[PDB]
Design a protein around this nucleic acid. Structure first.
Ligand SMILES: [Ca+2]
Ligand SMILES: [Ca+2]
Ligand SMILES: [Ca+2]
Ligand SMILES: [Ca+2]
Lengths: 363, 363
DNA sequence: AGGGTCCTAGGACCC
DNA sequence: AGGGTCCTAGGACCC
């Protein structure tokens, strides 16, 4: 029932794609520009004082010597994301994606293969690759330790294979479940990998500086918790289970309190092909008229430049706004094998600072 | 783009299972008893004046010489249902179930195989099996006619294979989509099969005596339609498409009006294993106290006698009532590999003439 | 920002 | 009755 999971995380991802979509961006302070905000920055830009999601005013005032490229189209980032997943699936079929720049892999079949291609002295060579968290000694007699180094060497290959093949540097974190693997990967922040052996566990949850840093405890679940006298991870651990049941509910409170201890029971989900393809247009309360039309038309050009890909096609259409609301309905089947579409999306709008079109229910 | 679909329908199904679960029920007027109502009756019982869903008072007063068996457990009906689907999947992998006693099969690969294992004189033998609807002549030069007899012979085998193998008599209806196939199967009502060739189409939709008889036009969609001056199938055909769009919506009105003409674009859904396993307890406002507990406990005994089957197991639990409402939440994973369950279902009840427990999200 | 994800409670429907 | 089904609009979450 103990596992080995690894968690692979692409570095300043959108920007690292850019330094390969244009070699001249190397050793330059690069930021990626989305409306009037820098969405992410390469490690030259981050030490000149540019910060992720700090306005592009102060991006150019802490670093008026910053270079910028556009990030309002995602295409190159997304393609380069799926080559990452694809590459990791070459190591194991079960890979779970998480946004464009993280992935998990269950290594427990592949660790249990690699321990049965070792005679005695290959086992005596079972070292760590990368760092160990909280600089913990390894008792190479604890099979949980043994397995959690076999997985870390596997993690090295995934990272070097990403480099030698795809050209991406990225961090990896190995640990007995998706949660501790996700928190340990970020520890040694530039390009490297870190493995959480079992006794290090509590040292990684109490190192957090607010329960919002817990994977899965979000914006609303922090508000509720903070209005109960729960701020520290240990508050959330020691708090009454029943009172948590009945302010947050049975599904949340069982889940997030079990998180605070470092527990995560969920398996690695083979994401496979995506569920949906969608696009967004933010504006400063600009759309105030049925020129909602234009952005609906404009968002549907790219979407039809997308939902002809990967050999599948959509059956439902959804229009999302914040004048969130959504209206959806099935695409009339004769359209599935532009413009008549547009009037469908206006039937959804007329049925109701942002407009979005979304194509899902792919078959 | 024309297709051949067949629609197989088990006769007085629950009762026909009974006449095989007990041979002594042959040539007896059999009804199946659910609370104080006869849920269905074999064809001896139906000609003595017993009617499906007429109280078991008048069931025993139009036919005080009726024999009855219990139908408040479904098990034998369900097992015998899936042997039907299984048997039809042996003919084609893509079978769509519909309640316990109907199925569709797409025969368009198997018709297109069988027409390429015919030399000339086997093609000259391509007759109908069963009846033709509206007693229509067959121009054996129209390939749509040709294919819609090849499918009807296939339909014979499914029915005789059901008999010789499973022992069930049942009706079959073949037609170019799931809708006309479903309406034509019921035409010749005792055990037989009927095929709708293309020109017969309108003769089968206008033969209906209210738009509730259309597959998919239900209880609510009839109410709305009837409050617009729509009662006949031709009312619904000729009614304004836009006004239908904006009283019934874009997804309904596009769908059900296209139904009224005999059109159904939806493919045959390979149902595969079921999505959910659930159970129900009706009562005459009896549960009025936390003896809701008992029925929750009682419904969970059978459900755990069920959700250990077919090699899969549930991840979410749902409690349904009508004091519909439902509350669900994920089953804590340590329970997935009774009694602690019961308290979960009471956390759902306390969060709120019927009580039901439902296990789905099977993995 | 701009993408993604699943859950839920209800809504219709079928038999 | 007593089972089943999918859709939808929202709800949370992640990056
Ligand atoms: Ca980074
Ligand atoms: Ca978080
Ligand atoms: Ca019948
Ligand atoms: Ca109907």
């Amino acid at each position: 029932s103990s596992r080995v999971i690894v968690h692979v995380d692409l570095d300043c991802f959108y920007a690292q794609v850019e330094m390969i979509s244009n070699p001249e961006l190397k050793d330059k302070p690069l930021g990626v520009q989305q409306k009037y905000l820098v969405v992410t920055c390469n490690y030259e830009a981050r030490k000149l004082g540019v910060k992720k999601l700090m306005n592009v005013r102060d991006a150019k005032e802490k670093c008026p010597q910053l270079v910028l490229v556009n990030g309002e189209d995602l295409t190159r980032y997304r393609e380069m994301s799926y080559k990452v997943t694809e590459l990791l699936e070459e190591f194991s079929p079960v890979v779970e994606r998480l946004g464009f720049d993280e992935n998990f892999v269950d290594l427990t079949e592949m660790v249990e293969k690699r321990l049965q291609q070792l005679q005695s002295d290959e086992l005596s060579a079972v070292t760590v690759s990368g760092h160990v968290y909280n600089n913990q000694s390894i008792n190479l007699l604890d099979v949980l330790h043994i397995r959690l180094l076999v997985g870390s060497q596997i993690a090295a290959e995934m990272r070097e294979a990403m480099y030698n093949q795809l050209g991406l540097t990225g961090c990896a974190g190995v640990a007995s479940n998706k949660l501790l693997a996700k928190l340990v990967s970020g520890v040694f922040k530039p390009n490297q990998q870190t493995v959480l052996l079992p006794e290090s566990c509590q040292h990684l949850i109490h190192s957090l500086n607010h329960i919002k840093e817990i994977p899965g405890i979000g914006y609303k679940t922090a508000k509720c918790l903070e209005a109960l006298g729960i701020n520290s991870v240990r508050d959330l651990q020691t708090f009454s289970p029943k009172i948590l049941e009945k302010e947050l509910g049975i599904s949340v409170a069982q889940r997030i309190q079990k998180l605070s201890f470092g527990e995560d029971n969920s398996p690695v989900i083979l994401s496979g092909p995506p569920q949906s393809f969608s696009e967004e247009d933010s504006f400063k309360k600009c759309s105030s008229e049925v020129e909602a039309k234009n952005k609906i038309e404009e968002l549907l050009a790219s979407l039809l430049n997308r939902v002809c890909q990967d050999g599948r096609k959509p059956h439902t259409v959804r229009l999302i706004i914040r004048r969130r609301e959504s209206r959806q309905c099935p695409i009339p089947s004769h359209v599935i094998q532009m413009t008549p579409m547009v009037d469908i999306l206006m039937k959804l709008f007329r049925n109701m600072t942002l407009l979005s079109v979304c194509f899902c229910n792919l078959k």
